[PDB]
Design a protein around this ligand. Structure first.
Ligand SMILES: Nc1ncnc2c1ncn2[C@@H]1O[C@H](COP(=O)(O)OP(=O)(O)OP(=O)(O)O)C[C@H]1O
Ligand SMILES: [Zn+2]
Ligand SMILES: [Zn+2]
Ligand SMILES: [Zn+2]
Lengths: 34, 46, 50, 65, 1105, 50
RNA sequence: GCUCGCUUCG
């Protein structure tokens, strides 16, 4: 779940070679870096 | 769902399902290309 | 345009719009549009003989 | 691979004069007189037609067909 | 009265190319290996038996390699084409089988066809399927007819075995040491052992040094040990010159100081200096003198053979060596290593022969071990080798040695690397030039600068200009256009003819005759063949007999008058070059012979047999007189050069008028042509490689060299002819840059295609589970696949014809995590790319291991822009500085606007007059519809193209009246217009552009990665830090090297000085003195590593005030 | 065998005999095209053995 | 992802 909005729309979307699991609703970066 | 492929020498439309040994009828060649898609593609003349 | 072989097929639609040659050379209507100064050869002294 | 439609420098239509040029090669015409008869005055179109290599048939020989 | 000249003489070059030339070397070597050498290797190890249980043996009868086949089918073979091996990522090999006879239970059992391995088949070889095929049959097999071949295909990759260069074996080398002492060295190498024995003069006397001796011993003691005990005979063998005796005096005095006067005493002294090879197994039983005699007979000077413990030949050899050292101790006539007459070239044949011999010996040893372990204790069930003949040994050995490229031969103690290299498919010229490469034994790691020089011995053999610019300058070379590498001969008739020609036996006379001024020593592959008088008659008779055909044409004979030695070389690897024989100021080749050759009456072999053209070696041509042209022929001429432009190699042949340019320009042009973009072959569409560059509209050059016609480069061009105007425009072409025309690029000029490969594998694991591809994950909201899975078809594999964007999946691969229900995790093949790509084809194949291999061929169509690198076939590499419109380009009276504007300032510093000559010739040719020739040391002259220009109404110097396109006013100076063959290089700005955000870091050291494919950041090297220090920018250096790279916050305890964690010190079991501290992560790693090394750094912290 | 992008580039260089004064410039975007500011050319060629 | 080798680039 997202720590800010509590949503479950956590998508793994890499932004320019940066692995990043981020919430799809508010854009809160859950996890980043591999 | 009928999945179609093309042989490397006979060039015939062969329908094979999942987990099948890659082969072609009336021959023994083992190179199987995929047919071109039917979706519309837009190109720029630039 | 191209050369084909039996089995091959070319199917397409072409959308053409108005455009100027500055954007792309394909809109250039003239193949070669140029100008040159008119020459005027003059003889300082009368040349004769071989 | 194939003869370009437009000349690189000027832009005269040259793709339509390729096969006929080949006909002039099938005839007794040389290179220079054939290029002159085709209407190529400037040397850019002459270089375009003369230095072009016809690789489309060599590739079609390897085409699936 | 000028000497008549044969105009058609150059026609001798293509005929030579019909049977020999560029690629025939490796092909012939591989054929000789697989047809003759392999049988000899099998015969050398035909019988293998074990010591236990005698009367048991395994006898090989005959070995075959057969035709290439694939083991895909279940226990059935099938013919496979090399292109199929390229596609399926398998090897192109043929089953090595052998027929044998053995004894199972003392009853003879024979097998007529039993496979034992798989030999990778070289392309276009004798057993290759591609040989003897027509271009139509090549098209049926999806192989280019113009492909040079000669390379191996292993696991889908193309490996080429480079020609190795090494020093000749069994040759005396007189050289100076580190301290200036002029000593000698001889590396006696036989089929079994290679031993380098040296001789020094460190203290005015000669000591002999070998790896089998504890201390170097005087040479006189060795002389006394080898049979000759009288000192007078030793002195006579060394020489009778006064200075020779004066130099050898100290050695005799040192020998007389000791009590060594007989052979037994000398052998005992030598044995005292012998050390056991670490407790050799077996009872010695007083082997000291015996070990000394065995080392003298077998180990020392292996190449010099002793009939039955008769060291007469070895004594004469070491006496000649001492004499050479004495003579070299005066006038500094030190032999040089870079002289290519002492060089030998090993092709793929000899390397493969050694590798196969080693593998077969290992297989025989393994079989003998298995026999010894199985036969004496198993059961009454008689053991047979057939149940234990593993067939994967030789196959895996060959595959690994060819693929990895590192060769480790313990039987020969040879540890080589970089033997095989990936064939470069940048262009046809790239592969054609890489096929004829030669690497040096120096194996560059340091600045030698002694072999890197261009020696005059490379004349006609190796290309002088073609060399990789960089660290490998001078140590990687290319063969010439007309060259040949010799093979090994039988050496029998050579010895017979030498003995019949009056060569006196060396055993019949003493060494004093060696000191006579008219007596010349005759050698043979490093062995003393004997002595002779009037060596001119001997050399003339040997050359005439070689010309007649009774002696092999590759046997070389040379004479050294300084050392008075007649060398007869018959070993393989020597470089030879054909030359026309000249007798009495008139060449043997006439116009009638060339007419017969042109009509087809005779071939090059007929010229060889009729004593018209003969092969000359470097050592042989050292004594011969060669004339470049007919007018240069004088009274003292023995040979005539066939064609001078054959001096250049393959890559150098593309240079139009290379003799008008500078040598660094030619080197840079060769380097860039090795990277030139263009077509690869007629099968370039079905070919699927990891990276391919193709040209949209390639055009053959207008100024083509005869080498281009010979190598058929005009069929596969790698560039385009553009109307270049040499002038300065807008100041965007300051240093090497060029201005491109926008309208030209818009109409297809310079348009290029980049093909990349994306391969995925679905393999079956040990457990009965397999990798499976899921369908496109359709979105329930819109009933359509998601943006990531948009391009996927119904089977989860991307379909050709669509465009792929960044971070899109091509194959929806999911793999199990077990190796009870299987658990699959997704590992899809995402497309990493800045620009979009189009899928041309998707190939799906199945290997024998049920692993599905899927290869997608992505295509990108790129247009020349700012940053693309362009070449002009003259080393004038440039970058597109500005793209101006067509109307901004200047125009002539005819209305022609230039495509490429190049800076004139690059001409004076580089002196590239050849570029101007090529431009003029190309302009004349496109005017009169002809193809002018830029042949080296020849070609079309300037007067002819000037007349062609003046005839067509243009200026005779290329400069034309041009009006400025911008201002509309004529220019004050005429502009140099003309068609130039410009070639685009693979170096693009799109691939080289890089930008690095925070991104990922490395696990060991938390710093950005290295490569762009790894998305790494730039590195501030030591010199950048030095510059930042010199500027005095402390804060910028701190931000770059600490804040932005490896910043971290550690916890240090102020009591013990150690590193804590989470504000706690485990050492002191307290947390009151623990304080946070900023630090580079590499510094913390260093501190931890030092603590691991018992070097404990104790940090005493303090307030910043 | 001819690439799709190369085919489109070759088709773009082909001149059209249409009078440009009777058409107008296509607005920004509007890829669908209208009757006033576009033209459509269909090219469908299927090669087969004689 | 670590290592090594080749290769290019200035
Ligand atoms: N090994 C290297 N170390 C440092 N810089 C290098 C190295 N190799 C190339 N460069 C860079 O390339 C430049 C070398 O060019 P330079 O030697 O001056 O001209 P050039 O290569 O001789 O060209 P010409 O042959 O004169 O046309 C200078 C340097 O910044
Ligand atoms: Zn088929
Ligand atoms: Zn033109
Ligand atoms: Zn502490």
């Amino acid at each position: 779940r997202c720590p800010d909005c509590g949503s479950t729309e956590l998508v793994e979307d890499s932004h320019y070679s940066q692995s990043q699991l981020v919430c799809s609703d508010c854009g809160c970066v859950v996890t980043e870096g591999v | 769902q009928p999945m179609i492929y093309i042989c490397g020498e006979c060039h015939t439309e062969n329908e094979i399902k999942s987990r099948d040994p890659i082969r072609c009828r009336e021959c023994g060649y083992r190179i199987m290309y995929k047919k071109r898609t039917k979706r519309l593609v837009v190109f720029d003349a630039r | 345009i191209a050369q084909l072989r039996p089995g091959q097929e070319i199917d397409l639609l072409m959308h053409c719009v108005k455009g100027i040659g500055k954007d792309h050379a394909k809109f250039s209507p003239v193949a070669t549009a140029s100008y040159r100064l008119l020459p005027d050869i003059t003889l300082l002294e009368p040349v004769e003989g071989e | 691979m194939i003869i370009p439609v437009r000349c690189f420098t000027c832009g005269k239509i040259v793709g339509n004069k390729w096969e006929a040029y080949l006909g002039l090669l099938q005839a007794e015409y040389t290179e220079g007189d054939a290029l002159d008869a085709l209407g190529l005055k400037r040397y850019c179109c002459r270089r375009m037609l003369l230095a072009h290599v016809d690789l489309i048939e060599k590739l079609l020989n390897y085409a699936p067909l | 009265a000028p000497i008549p000249t044969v105009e058609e003489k150059w026609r001798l070059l293509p005929a030579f190319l019909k049977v020999k030339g560029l690629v025939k070397q490796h092909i012939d070597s591989f054929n000789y290996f697989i047809n003759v050498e392999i049988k000899k290797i099998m015969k050398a190890n035909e019988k293998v038996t074990s010591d236990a249980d005698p009367m048991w043996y395994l006898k090989y009868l005959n070995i075959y390699v057969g035709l290439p086949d694939v083991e895909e089918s279940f226990n059935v073979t099938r013919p496979v084409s090399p292109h199929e091996c390229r596609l399926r990522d398998m090897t192109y090999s043929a089953p090595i089988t052998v027929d044998i006879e053995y004894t199972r239970g003392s009853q003879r059992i024979i097998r007529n066809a039993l496979p034992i391995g798989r030999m990778p088949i070289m392309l276009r070889s004798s057993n290759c399927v591609l040989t003897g095929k027509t271009p139509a049959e090549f098209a049926k097999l999806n192989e280019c007819p113009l492909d040079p071949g000669g390379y191996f295909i292993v696991k889908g990759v193309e490996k080429v075995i480079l020609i190795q260069e090494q020093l000749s074996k069994n040759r005396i080398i007189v050289e100076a040491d580190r301290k200036g002492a002029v000593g000698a060295s001889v590396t006696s190498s036989t089929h079994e052992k290679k031993s380098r024995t040296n001789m020094a003069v460190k203290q005015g006397r000669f000591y002999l040094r070998h790896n089998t001796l504890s201390e170097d011993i005087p040479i006189v003691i060795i002389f006394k040990a080898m049979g000759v005990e009288s000192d007078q005979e030793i002195v006579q063998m060394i020489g009778t010159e006064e200075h020779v005796m004066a130099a050898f005096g100290p050695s005799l005095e040192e020998c007389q100081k000791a009590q060594i006067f007989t052979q037994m005493q000398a052998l005992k002294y030598i044995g005292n200096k012998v050390r056991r090879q670490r407790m050799w197994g077996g009872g010695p039983k007083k082997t000291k003198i015996e070990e000394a005699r065995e080392l003298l007979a077998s180990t020392i000077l292996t190449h010099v053979p002793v009939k039955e413990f008769n060291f007469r030949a070895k004594c004469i050899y070491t006496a000649v060596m001492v004499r050479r050292v004495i003579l070299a101790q005066g006038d500094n006539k030190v032999d040089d290593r870079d002289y290519y007459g002492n060089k030998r070239l090993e092709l793929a044949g000899q390397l493969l022969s050694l590798l196969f011999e080693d593998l077969f010996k290992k297989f025989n040893s393994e079989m003998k071990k298995i026999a010894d372990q199985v036969i004496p204790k198993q059961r009454a069930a008689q053991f047979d080798v057939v149940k234990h003949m593993r067939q994967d040994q030789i196959t895996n050995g060959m595959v690994n040695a060819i693929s990895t490229g590192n060769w480790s031969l313990k039987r020969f103690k040879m540890d080589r690397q970089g033997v095989t290299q990936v064939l470069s498919r940048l262009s046809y010229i790239s592969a054609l030039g890489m096929m004829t490469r030669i690497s040096s034994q120096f194996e560059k790691t340091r600045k030698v600068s002694g072999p890197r020089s261009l020696q005059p011995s490379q004349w006609g053999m190796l290309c002088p200009s073609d060399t990789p610019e960089g660290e490998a300058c001078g140590l990687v070379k290319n063969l010439a256009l007309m060259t040949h590498i010799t093979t090994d001969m039988e050496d029998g008739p050579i010895v017979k003819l030498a003995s019949n020609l009056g060569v006196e036996d060396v055993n019949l006379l003493c060494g004093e005759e060696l000191s006579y001024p008219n007596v010349f020593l005759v050698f043979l592959n490093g062995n003393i063949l004997g002595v002779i008088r009037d060596h001119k008659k001997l050399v003339n008779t040997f050359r005439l007999m070689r010309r007649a055909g009774y002696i092999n044409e590759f046997v070389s004979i040379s004479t050294n008058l300084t050392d008075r030695c007649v060398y007869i070389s018959s070993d393989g690897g020597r470089l030879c070059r054909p030359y026309i024989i000249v007798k009495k100021q008139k060449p043997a080749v006439t116009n009638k012979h060339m007419e017969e050759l042109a009509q087809g009456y005779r071939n090059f072999e007929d010229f060889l047999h009729e004593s018209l053209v003969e092969y000359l070696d470097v050592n042989e041509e050292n004594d011969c007189n060669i004339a470049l042209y007919e007018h240069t022929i004088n009274k003292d001429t023995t040979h005539l050069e066939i064609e001078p432009f054959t001096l250049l190699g393959v890559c150098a042949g593309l240079i139009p008028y290379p003799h008008h340019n500078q040598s660094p320009r030619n080197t840079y042009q060769c380097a860039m042509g090795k990277q030139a973009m263009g077509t690869i072959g007629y099968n370039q569409r079905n070919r699927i490689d990891t990276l391919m560059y193709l040209l949209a509209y390639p055009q053959k050059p207008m100024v083509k060299t005869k080498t281009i016609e010979l190598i058929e480069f005009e069929k596969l061009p790698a560039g385009q002819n553009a109307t270049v105007a040499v002038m300065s425009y807008s100041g965007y072409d300051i240093e090497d840059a060029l201005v491109l025309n926008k309208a030209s690029l818009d109409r297809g000029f310079g348009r290029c295609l980049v093909y990349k490969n994306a391969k995925c594998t679905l393999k079956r694991y040990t457990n009965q589970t397999f990798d499976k591809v899921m369908g496109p994950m359709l979105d329930a909201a819109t009933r359509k696949p998601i943006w990531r899975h948009e391009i996927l078809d119904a089977d989860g594999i991307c379909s050709p014809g669509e465009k792929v964007e960044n971070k899109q999946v091509l194959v929806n691969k999911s793999m199990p995590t077990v190796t009870q229900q299987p658990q699959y995790k997704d590992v899809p093949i995402t497309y990493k790319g800045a620009t979009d790509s189009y899928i041309e084809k998707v190939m799906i194949s199945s290997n024998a291991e049920d692993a599905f291999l899927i290869k997608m061929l992505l295509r990108q169509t790129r247009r020349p822009e700012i940053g693309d690198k362009f070449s002009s076939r003259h080393g004038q590499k440039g970058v597109c500085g500005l793209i101006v419109p067509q109307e901004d380009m200047p125009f002539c009276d005819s209305g022609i606007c230039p495509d490429i504007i190049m800076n004139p300032h690059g001409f004076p510093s580089r002196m590239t007059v050849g570029k101007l000559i090529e431009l003029l010739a190309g302009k004349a040719g496109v005017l009169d519809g002809r193809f002018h020739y830029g042949t080296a040391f020849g070609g079309s002259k300037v007067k002819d193209v000037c007349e062609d220009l003046v005839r067509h109404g243009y200026n005779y110097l290329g400069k034309d009246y041009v009006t400025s396109g911008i201002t509309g006013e004529p220019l004050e100076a005429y502009i140099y217009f003309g068609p130039v063959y410009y070639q685009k290089l693979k170096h693009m700005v799109l691939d080289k552009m890089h930008a690095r955000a925070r991104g990922p870091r490395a696990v060991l050291t938390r710093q950005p990665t290295e490569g762009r494919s790894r998305d790494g950041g730039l590195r501030l090297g030591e010199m950048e830090r030095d510059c930042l220090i010199g500027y005095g920018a402390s804060m910028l250096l701190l931000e770059r090297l600490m804040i932005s790279s490896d910043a971290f916050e550690v916890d240090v305890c102020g009591q013990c000085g150690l590193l804590g964690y989470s504000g706690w010190c485990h050492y002191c079991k307290s947390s009151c003195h623990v304080s946070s501290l900023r630090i580079p992560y590499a510094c913390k790693l260093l501190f931890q590593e030092l603590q691991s090394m018992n070097i404990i750094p104790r940090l005493k912290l303090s307030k910043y005030n | 065998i001819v690439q799709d992008e190369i085919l489109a580039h070759r088709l773009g260089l082909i001149p059209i005999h249409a009078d440009p004064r009777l058409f107008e410039y296509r607005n920004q975007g509007d890829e669908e095209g209208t009757e006033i500011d576009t033209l459509q050319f269909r090219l469908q060629v299927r090669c087969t053995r004689n």
